[PDB]
Amino acid sequence: MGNCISPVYVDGSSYANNALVQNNGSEYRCLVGGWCTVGGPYAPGTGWAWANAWELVRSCQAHHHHHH
């Protein structure tokens, strides 16, 4: 299906080039794996050009509302 089958972003945990993740509170379709992990959590990576690894599409975290 076109739903998020991948977890939220885990740097270092495990990946293949096809490894998808999610970031910016939106989904990341990662097509390169080594370059995907370069995307640090402070990095404003567009994915498309700067990373050349992910496509930022839309949110799929399911849980509603946020708090800190």
Contacts of 16 (CB under 8 A, 6+ apart): 33
DSSP 27: E
**Angle 62-55-44 (CA atoms, 0-180°, nearest 5)?**
90
Distance CA 1, CA 16 (A): 20
66: left (phi over 0), alpha (psi -120 to 50) or beta: beta
DSSP 41: T
Bridge partners (DSSP) listed for residue 18: none
Where b means 16+ CB within 10 Å and e means fewer, 53-66 reads bbebeeeeeeeeee
Which method, experimentally, gave rise to this model? NMR
Cβ atoms of 66 and 9 closer than 8 Å: no
